[PDB]
Design an enzyme around this catalytic site. Structure first.
Site, PDB file in Angstrom:
ATOM      1  CG  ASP C 300      -4.622 -26.827  -0.524  1.00 38.88           C
ATOM      2  OD1 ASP C 300      -5.338 -26.027  -1.276  1.00 38.88           O
ATOM      3  OD2 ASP C 300      -5.033 -27.758  -0.140  1.00 38.88           O
ATOM      4  CE  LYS C 303      -6.005 -18.702   4.856  1.00 39.53           C
ATOM      5  NZ  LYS C 303      -7.282 -17.774   4.102  1.00 39.53           N
ATOM      6  CB  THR C 304      -5.722 -23.099   9.884  1.00 35.45           C
ATOM      7  OG1 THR C 304      -6.388 -23.833  11.232  1.00 35.45           O
ATOM      8  CG2 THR C 304      -5.369 -24.335   9.010  1.00 35.45           C
ATOM      9  CG  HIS C 341     -13.569 -10.383  -2.178  1.00 37.02           C
ATOM     10  ND1 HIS C 341     -14.960  -9.493  -1.910  1.00 37.02           N
ATOM     11  CD2 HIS C 341     -12.835  -9.393  -2.246  1.00 37.02           C
ATOM     12  CE1 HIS C 341     -14.761  -8.294  -2.330  1.00 37.02           C
ATOM     13  NE2 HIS C 341     -13.294  -8.242  -2.708  1.00 37.02           N
TER      14      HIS C 341
END
Lengths: 556, 157, 650
Positions: C300, C303-304, C341
Site C-alpha cells: 500500500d 511502489k507502482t 521473496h
C-alpha cells in the site's frame, strides 16, 4: 558387429544381440498384419498384393466406419517390397517427361495465347495481372542482396559434385562445387569477399535428375542442383520465406493448414485443393509474367537451365525449376498464394482465408470452381479426386480429418525384417489406435499377437510415447530393464550402430566461421545458457543395431 | 572494415558486372621462364604466354600477386521464349516513340480498367478511356511504357 | 505537535507516524488515552484490508500423540509470512488448536480475533486464519515441505520412517483418496458419462466404446488414489505395494497447500505502471550504460505509482520479466518490481531479473513496517549492491521532525544488514503528487533519478573484464595449425598474446598466432565477436569443447561449489516428480554438459518441481568457473532447472 559370443551377459549385450536377430516368418508379414487388423475391425481383407494399391475409400458412413475404411486404402499404399513387376522408376520418368511437355504447351499459351482454345482467358488474364500486382508489392522490385546472403547456406543433401555420403555442408566448403554460367558471378563475388579460397570445380548448365521412392506405383523425380547454385537458390528461398509471412503464410509451421483442414471437415466451408505434379508444372512463362523482372532475372541466374538424365540424354527445362531446387518450395507457395488471394478479391471473398504450404492449398470452398479454371490456364492440373470443396473429408499437410475426427492413417513402407522394423510398425499401430494410453480392443488383439514375434526381452521393454521407436511404446514404469539411478530412470533403446568417418577439418572450420558470420518470460533466459551449435562429426551407419540407454519420464 | 559482408559482396558483384561474362578477375601464381599461371578460381589454373607481358625490349614488369583478366572457355537456347517476344517488346518501344498504333486484344476486366495483350505483352488499359469475346482485336496507342519493370499503359481511341 | 512524544508513541504497536500524531491531536498529551482509542480504531482499519486478496501465508502442523492438527494462515505477501510477528501469530493459533482439539475453524477465528487486528493494524496486510483440520490414527506423521505445503498421515503397523515417507509422497503427488475403491461410488459415475460421450461420438461400437471408457477409468482412478500412485521414492512400485510389503495400512491423510483454491489474480506490473503514466553525440547514444533497478517495499506504499511517476517526469523533462524502462541523460534504466521473496530469487537465478540497485519505498505516513525488515533482508540475500530509499507520500506528513525520525528508522534498519545507513540517499518526495505537475514534488522525482545515476555504479562492461572465450570446437588446419572457435565472452584477445586452456583436463598454455573471421582476418578478438583463435604448438587432440581460452591466471578450474538453484515446475516443461538426496543430473556450463552430484541443505530431504534451493555440487570433471557463473541443469537434453555458482570450493 561385436559381440555375439558367450562372453559377457550384461543386459545390453543380450538386448543388442536380440536386436540383431531376424523376424523369421513366411510370406509378406507387413500384409499379414494389415489383414488381421482389417479383420479385427470387421473388414474385407486384401485379396492380393494388387488390391493394396488399388483399394479406394468410401467417403460416407460413420466416422469410425471411415477411419478404418480410409486406413485400408492407405496403409499398404506405399509398400516398398511388392512383387507385381511394376516399374516404379519408368512410370516416374513418364510423368516427368509428360509434365515437362505440359510446360511447353503452357509456355506457348502464356507467351502468346490462342483464343480458339478451351481455356477461360478472361478470368485468368485478369487474375494474373492482379496477382502480379499483389506479388510486386510483397517482394519488391528486386531481392535484397543482403537478405539473400542472410539466408545463403549449404543443404545437407547431395549435389552435382557430392554424393549423399559427402552431403554434409563441411564437404561443400571443402570440395570445389559446380555452378552454371549465369550464377558464376555470385561465386566470384563471394570469392572476392573472403580470404578463404572459395573455389569452383566446373562451369556447366546441367543439373542431375534422379528418382526417389514415393509409393508403390511410382517413384519421384527430383533435381540435384549444382553446388554453388543451391547455395544461392536457398538465399532466395529465405527471402521469400520471410516475405510470405505477410500473407499469413508460415512455411515453418504445418499446423496452420492442419487446423484449417480440421475446420473444413466440420464447417464444410473450407476446401483442401490437391494438385498433380504441381512442383514440376511451374512454367517459365507464368514466372516471367508474375515475378517483377529484377527478381525473375535472379531466379533465371540461379536455376539450372539444362539437366542430364540417368540415361545420358539432356533435357532443356521448360519449367523454371524442379522440386530439388532451393527456392522452388518457396516460389510455388508464392505463386499459388497470389493466384488464390487474387481469386478471392475477384469473387469478393476474404483473401485472408488463403493458406498455402507449397503444393498444399486451403481455400474457401466457394472459390475452388474459379480457382480450378485459373490453374488449368497457367498450366496446373487439379486432381478432382483428392480435392475436397464439400463433404465431411479434408486433408492438408499430413493430417486427415472426417467430421472433425482425426482419421490420419499410418504407412507400413518396408519389409518388416529386423525387430527394430517390427517395433516401429507395432508403435505406429499403437499410436493410431490408442486414446490417451487406452487401447482399442479391436486393434489391441492384433497388436498383442504380432508383438509375440519379437524376442522375449524386447517384448516387455517399453518406453513412453514421444521418445522415438527404439522400443515398444507403453508404460515405462513397469519396464523391468529401466534403471532409476540418480533419480532419473534410463531406458535401453535400439539405435543404428555407426562407424566414425574423418571429417573435412578445414571444410568444417569454414562451415563454422560462416555460420557465425551470417548472424513464459522466465523460462526464456534459461535456454540462453545452452549453446545450440553442433560440432561437425561425420558417421556411417552399418545396418547393425546398438543399444544405448536414454533418460525417460513417466508421462503421469 | 567495416564495411559489412553483405556490403563487400554487393560491390564485388557490381564490379564483376562491369566486365564481360568471358573475362575473369584472377591472380597470378608462379611465373616461369616461359609461362605465367593465373588463378581465376577454377580447377585448372590459366596459363598465359609470358612473352606478351614484356616491355618494348625484354623483361616482364608483372609479378606474382597481381590480378590479370583472363578469358574463360565458352564451352560449349530456350526455344520457348524464342516465340518472338523480345522484338515483340521492342515493337511497343518503337511504336511508342513514333506515336503509332499497335494491334492488341482486351482479355478481361481489372481494378484500374482492363488487361490488354499486345504480341504477348500485358499492358494496362485505364478504362478512362459493349464487348466482349472472343477478345476482339483493337488498335491501341501506347501512352506510358515503363522500360525496366515491364509495365505499359495503353490508350483506346 | 510534540514530535518527541509521538516517537515514544510508536511503542507499542508500530502504528503509522501520522496515525500517532493524529491520535494525540485528538486527546492531547495523554499517551495512554491515545493508545486506547487508537486500539479500538484499528478494528475498522482491519475490515478495510479485508478486500485485499491474501493467497499467501503458511501451513503449520503439530502432533501430540495420536492426534495431529493442520492449519493455514493467510497474509498478502510472503514477506509477511517470513516475518517474526506473523509467525508468532500462527504458532500461537496452532498451539490453541492442538491444546483444545479445536476443529471448528470459526471457534478458532473468534478466539484470535482481537490478536489478529492488532497484528493487521501493525502490518497493514489482510491476515486470516483460513482453515483447520484434525487427524487421528494409530500412528501419525507430518511432513512440512517448506512453509507452502504440509501433510498429516495416519497408518497402522508402520514405523515413523515409513509414515514420514508417505507424508512426503502425499505432498508431491497430491492424491485425493486412500485406495482407488475409496473414490465416490456415484460421483465417479458422472466422469464415466463424460467419457462415454467422447467415445460414442465417432465412435462405436458400444461394447468397444464402454470397454475403452472403463479402461481409462481404472487408469484415472488409480492416479487419484494414494495406493495407485507410484511411490515418489521408488517409482517402480505403487504406494499400495509399498504398504502391503511393510504390512501397513493408511487410515487417513490431509494435505494443505497455501492459497489452494484461491483466485490467484495475475498482476501485470508493466501494464499498471504504463496505464498510470502521462496523466561523439552519435556514438554516445549507442554507448549509454544499461542499469537494472527495482522497487521493493510495502504494498500500500505505492511502489507502482512511484515508478509511474519516474517514467512520466523523465518523459516531461527529457522527452523519452514484466519490466518497465526509462531514460536519464547519462544512462538507460530497466525497472522491475519485487512483489515476493521467492519470486525474485527465482528470477535472480534464471537471469530474468538482475538488479544493480534497489529502491526501498517507505510511505512517510506509516514509517517502516514490520515486514520492512524482510524487504531489506531480501536485498542482502540476493546480493543487491546498493539500496536507495524514497520516502513516499511526504506531502501528508505535517511536522518535519516526523520525516527525520523516519529517516533514522530506515537508516538503522539498513545498518542492521551491513548497508551504509549513514550514507544511504533518502529522497523525501511524493509519488502521487508528481503526476499532477507539482514541480516542488516533480523535482524530488528528478532528485531520486539523480541518485540512481550517482549512487548506483555503472556495471563493469564485458569488454573491461579479463579475456575468456568458451571453446565450441577444435580444428587442425593442415599446413597452418590448430584453431578453436567461439564467441569471446569477455575481454580482448590480441595476436601474440598468450593464453591458457582451462577446464576438463589439465590447464595448459599457448600463444595466439592469429584471430580469424569469415569476412576477413583480424588482429584482435573483441568481446561479443565470433572468431577462430589460431594457437601455437598445442594440437587438436589436447583441446575440446567445454574448455575456455583465458588470459593466463584469470579463471581457474573447480569441481566442487555452492549454488543457488531453481528446479523448473511441471507446466514449465520441467521434472514431473521430486528428487532426493542422491540426485545425479547433468550440469551445463557454457558449451557442454558435465555430470555432478548434489548435497541438499540440512533439513531438506525432498526437492520438488518449482523449488528454490541451495546445494553443493561436485562435478565429474573440473570446469573453468568463478562466482556468479550461471548454468543449466539438464537430464539428457531436457532442461530441468538452472542455477548460479554462489561459492567456489576445495
Amino acid at each position: 558387429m561385436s559381440k555375439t559370443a558367450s562372453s559377457r551377459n550384461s543386459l545390453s549385450a543380450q538386448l543388442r544381440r536380440a536386436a540383431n536377430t531376424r523376424i523369421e516368418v513366411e510370406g509378406n508379414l507387413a500384409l499379414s498384419i494389415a489383414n488381421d487388423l482389417l479383420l479385427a475391425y470387421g473388414q474385407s481383407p486384401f485379396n492380393s498384393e494388387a488390391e493394396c494399391i488399388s483399394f479406394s475409400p468410401r467417403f460416407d458412413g460413420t466416422p469410425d466406419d471411415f477411419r478404418i475404411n480410409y486406413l485400408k486404402a492407405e496403409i499398404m499404399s506405399k509398400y516398398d517390397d511388392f512383387s507385381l513387376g511394376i516399374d516404379t522408376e519408368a512410370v516416374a520418368w513418364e510423368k516427368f517427361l509428360a509434365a515437362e511437355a505440359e510446360c511447353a504447351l503452357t509456355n506457348a499459351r502464356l507467351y502468346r495465347p490462342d483464343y480458339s482454345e478451351d481455356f477461360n482467358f478472361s478470368l485468368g488474364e485478369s487474375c494474373i495481372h492482379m496477382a502480379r500486382r499483389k506479388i510486386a508489392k510483397l517482394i519488391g522490385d528486386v531481392p535484397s542482396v543482403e537478405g539473400m546472403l542472410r539466408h545463403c547456406r549449404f543443404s545437407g543433401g547431395a549435389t552435382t559434385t557430392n554424393n549423399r555420403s559427402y552431403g554434409h555442408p563441411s564437404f561443400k566448403f571443402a570440395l570445389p562445387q559446380a555452378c552454371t554460367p549465369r550464377a558464376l558471378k555470385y561465386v566470384l563475388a563471394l570469392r572476392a569477399s573472403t580470404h578463404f579460397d572459395t573455389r569452383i570445380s566446373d562451369i556447366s548448365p546441367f543439373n542431375k535428375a534422379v528418382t526417389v521412392p514415393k509409393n508403390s506405383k511410382t517413384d519421384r523425380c527430383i533435381a540435384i542442383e549444382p553446388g554453388w547454385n543451391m547455395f544461392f537458390q536457398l538465399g532466395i528461398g529465405g527471402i521469400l520465406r520471410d516475405r510470405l509471412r505477410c500473407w499469413g503464410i508460415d512455411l515453418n509451421d504445418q499446423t496452420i493448414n492442419q487446423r484449417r483442414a480440421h475446420e473444413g471437415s466440420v464447417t464444410n466451408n473450407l476446401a483442401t485443393v490437391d494438385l498433380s505434379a504441381a512442383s514440376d508444372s511451374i512454367s517459365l512463362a507464368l514466372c516471367e509474367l508474375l515475378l517483377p523482372p529484377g527478381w525473375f532475372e535472379v531466379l533465371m541466374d540461379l536455376r539450372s537451365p539444362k539437366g542430364r538424365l540417368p540415361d545420358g540424354s539432356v533435357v532443356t527445362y521448360e519449367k523454371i525449376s524442379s522440386m530439388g531446387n532451393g527456392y522452388t518450395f518457396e516460389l510455388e507457395s508464392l505463386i499459388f498464394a497470389s493466384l488464390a488471394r487474387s481469386v478471392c478479391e475477384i469473387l469478393d471473398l476474404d483473401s485472408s482465408e488463403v493458406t498455402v504450404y507449397g503444393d498444399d492449398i486451403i481455400l474457401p470452398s466457394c472459390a475452388v470452381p474459379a480457382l480450378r479454371e485459373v490453374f488449368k490456364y497457367v498450366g496446373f492440373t487439379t486432381n478432382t479426386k483428392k480435392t475436397f470443396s464439400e463433404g465431411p473429408f479434408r486433408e492438408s499437410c499430413g493430417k486427415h480429418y472426417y467430421s472433425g475426427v482425426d482419421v490420419t492413417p499410418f504407412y507400413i513402407r518396408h519389409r518388416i525384417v529386423s525387430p527394430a522394423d517390427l517395433i516401429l510398425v507395432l508403435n505406429n499401430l499403437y499410436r493410431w489406435a490408442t486414446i490417451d494410453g487406452v487401447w482399442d480392443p479391436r486393434a489391441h488383439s492384433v497388436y498383442l499377437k504380432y508383438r509375440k514375434l519379437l524376442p522375449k526381452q524386447l517384448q516387455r521393454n517399453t518406453i513412453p510415447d514421444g521418445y522415438g521407436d527404439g522400443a515398444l511404446v507403453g508404460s515405462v514404469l513397469i519396464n523391468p530393464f529401466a534403471k532409476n539411478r540418480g533419480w532419473i530412470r534410463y531406458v535401453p533403446v535400439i539405435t543404428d550402430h555407426t562407424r566414425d568417418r574423418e571429417r573435412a577439418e578445414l571444410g568444417s572450420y569454414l562451415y563454422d566461421l560462416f555460420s557465425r558470420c551470417l548472424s513464459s518470460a522466465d523460462l526464456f533466459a534459461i535456454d540462453q545458457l545452452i549453446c545450440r551449435s553442433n560440432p561437425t562429426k561425420i558417421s556411417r551407419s552399418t545396418g547393425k543395431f546398438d543399444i544405448q540407454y536414454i533418460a525417460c519420464s513417466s508421462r503421469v | 572494415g567495416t564495411e559489412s559482408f553483405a556490403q563487400l559482396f554487393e560491390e564485388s558483384l557490381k564490379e564483376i558486372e562491369t566486365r564481360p561474362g568471358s573475362i575473369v578477375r584472377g591472380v597470378v601464381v608462379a611465373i616461369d621462364k616461359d609461362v605465367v599461371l593465373v588463378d581465376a578460381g577454377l580447377k585448372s589454373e590459366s596459363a598465359i604466354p609470358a612473352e606478351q607481358f614484356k616491355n618494348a625490349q625484354g623483361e616482364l614488369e608483372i609479378q606474382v600477386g597481381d590480378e590479370v583478366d583472363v578469358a574463360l572457355d565458352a564451352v560449349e537456347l530456350l526455344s520457348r521464349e524464342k516465340a518472338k517476344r523480345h522484338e515483340a517488346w521492342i515493337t511497343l518501344e518503337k511504336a511508342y516513340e513514333d506515336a503509332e498504333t499497335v494491334t492488341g486484344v482486351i482479355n478481361g476486366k481489372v481494378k484500374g480498367g482492363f488487361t490488354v495483350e499486345l504480341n504477348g505483352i500485358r499492358a494496362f488499359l485505364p478504362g478512362s478511356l459493349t464487348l466482349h469475346l472472343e477478345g476482339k482485336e483493337l488498335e491501341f496507342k501506347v501512352i506510358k511504357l515503363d522500360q525496366k519493370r515491364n509495365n505499359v499503359v495503353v490508350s483506346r481511341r | 505537535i510534540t514530535a518527541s512524544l509521538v516517537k515514544e508513541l510508536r511503542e507499542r504497536t508500530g502504528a503509522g507516524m501520522m496515525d500517532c500524531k493524529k491520535a494525540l491531536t485528538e486527546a492531547n498529551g495523554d499517551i495512554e488515552l491515545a493508545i486506547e482509542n487508537m486500539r479500538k480504531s484499528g478494528a475498522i482499519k482491519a475490515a478495510k484490508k479485508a478486500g485485499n486478496v491474501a493467497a499467501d501465508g503458511v501451513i503449520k502442523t503439530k502432533i501430540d500423540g495420536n492426534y495431529g492438527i493442520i492449519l493455514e494462515v493467510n497474509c498478502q505477501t510472503d514477506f509477511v509470512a517470513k516475518d517474526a510477528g506473523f509467525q508468532a501469530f500462527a504458532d500461537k493459533v496452532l498451539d490453541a488448536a492442538v491444546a483444545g482439539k479445536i476443529t471448528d475453524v470459526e471457534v478458532l477465528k473468534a478466539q484470535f480475533e482481537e490478536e489478529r487486528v492488532a497484528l493487521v493494524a501493525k502490518i497493514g496486510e489482510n491476515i486470516n486464519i483460513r482453515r483447520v483440520a484434525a487427524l487421528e490414527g494409530d500412528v501419525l506423521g507430518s511432513y512440512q515441505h517448506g512453509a507452502r505445503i504440509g501433510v498429516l498421515v495416519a497408518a497402522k503397523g508402520a514405523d515413523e520412517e515409513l509414515v514420514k515417507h508417505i507424508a512426503m509422497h502425499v505432498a508431491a503427488s497430491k492424491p485425493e483418496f486412500i485406495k482407488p475403491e475409496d473414490v465416490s461410488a456415484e460421483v465417479v459415475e458422472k466422469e464415466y458419462q463424460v467419457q462415454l460421450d467422447i467415445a460414442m461420438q465417432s465412435g462405436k461400437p458400444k461394447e468397444i466404446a464402454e470397454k475403452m471408457v472403463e479402461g481409462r477409468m481404472k487408469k484415472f482412478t488409480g492416479e487419484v488414489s494414494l495406493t495407485g500412485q507410484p511411490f515418489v521414492m521408488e517409482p517402480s512400485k505403487t504406494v499400495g505395494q509399498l504398504l502391503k510389503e511393510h504390512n501397513a495400512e493408511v487410515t487417513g491423510f490431509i494435505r494443505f497447500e497455501v492459497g489452494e483454491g484461491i483466485e490467484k489474480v495475475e498482476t501485470d506490473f508493466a501494464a499498471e505502471v504504463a496505464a498510470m503514466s502521462k496523466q561523439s553525440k552519435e556514438k554516445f547514444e549507442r554507448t549509454k550504460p544499461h542499469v537494472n533497478v527495482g522497487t521493493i517495499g510495502h504494498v500500500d506504499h505505492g511502489k507502482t505509482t512511484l515508478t509511474a511517476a519516474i517514467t512520466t517526469v523523465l518523459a516531461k523533462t527529457y522527452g523519452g520479466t514484466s519490466h518497465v524502462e526509462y531514460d536519464t541523460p547519462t544512462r538507460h534504466y530497466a525497472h522491475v518490481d519485487c512483489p515476493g521473496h521467492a519470486d525474485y530469487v527465482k528470477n535472480m537465478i534464471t537471469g530474468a531479473a538482475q538488479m544493480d540497485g534497489a529502491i526501498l519505498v517507505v510511505a512517510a505516513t506509516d514509517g517502516p513496517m514490520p515486514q520492512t525488515r524482510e524487504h531489506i533482508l531480501l536485498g542482502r540475500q540476493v546480493g543487491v549492491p546498493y539500496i536507495i530509499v524514497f520516502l513516499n507520500k511526504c506531502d501528508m506528513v505535517d511536522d518535519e521532525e516526523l520525516l527525520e525520525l523516519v529517516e533514522m528508522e530506515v537508516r538503522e534498519l539498513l545498518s542492521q544488514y551491513d548497508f551504509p545507513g549513514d550514507d544511504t540517499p533518502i529522497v523525501r518526495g511524493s509519488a502521487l503528487k508528481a503526476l499532477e505537475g507539482d514541480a516542488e514534488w516533480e523535482a524530488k522525482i528528478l532528485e531520486l533519478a539523480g541518485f540512481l545515476d550517482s549512487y548506483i555504479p555503472e556495471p563493469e562492461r564485458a569488454i573491461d573484464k579479463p579475456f575468456l572465450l568458451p571453446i565450441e570446437d577444435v580444428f587442425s588446419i593442415s599446413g597452418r595449425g590448430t584453431v578453436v572457435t567461439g564467441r569471446v565472452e569477455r575481454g580482448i584477445i590480441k595476436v601474440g598474446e598468450e593464453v591458457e586452456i582451462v577446464g576438463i583436463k589439465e590447464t595448459q598454455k599457448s600463444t595466439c598466432t592469429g584471430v580469424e573471421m569469415f569476412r576477413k582476418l583480424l588482429d584482435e578478438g573483441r568481446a561479443g565477436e565470433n572468431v577462430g583463435v589460431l594457437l601455437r604448438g598445442i594440437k587438436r587432440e589436447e583441446i575440446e569443447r567445454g574448455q575456455v581460452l583465458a588470459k593466463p591466471g584469470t579463471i581457474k578450474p573447480h569441481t566442487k561449489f555452492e549454488s543457488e538453484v531453481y528446479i523448473l515446475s511441471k507446466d514449465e516443461g520441467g521434472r514431473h516428480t521430486p528428487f532426493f538426496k542422491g540426485y545425479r543430473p547433468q550440469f551445463y556450463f557454457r558449451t557442454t554438459d558435465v555430470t555432478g552430484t548434489i548435497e541438499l541443505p540440512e533439513g531438506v530431504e525432498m526437492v520438488m518441481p518449482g523449488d528454490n534451493i541451495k546445494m553443493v555440487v561436485t562435478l565429474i570433471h573440473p570446469i573453468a568457473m568463478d562466482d556468479g557463473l550461471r548454468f543449466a541443469i539438464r537430464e539428457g537434453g531436457r532442461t530441468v532447472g538452472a542455477g548460479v555458482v554462489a561459492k567456489v570450493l576445495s
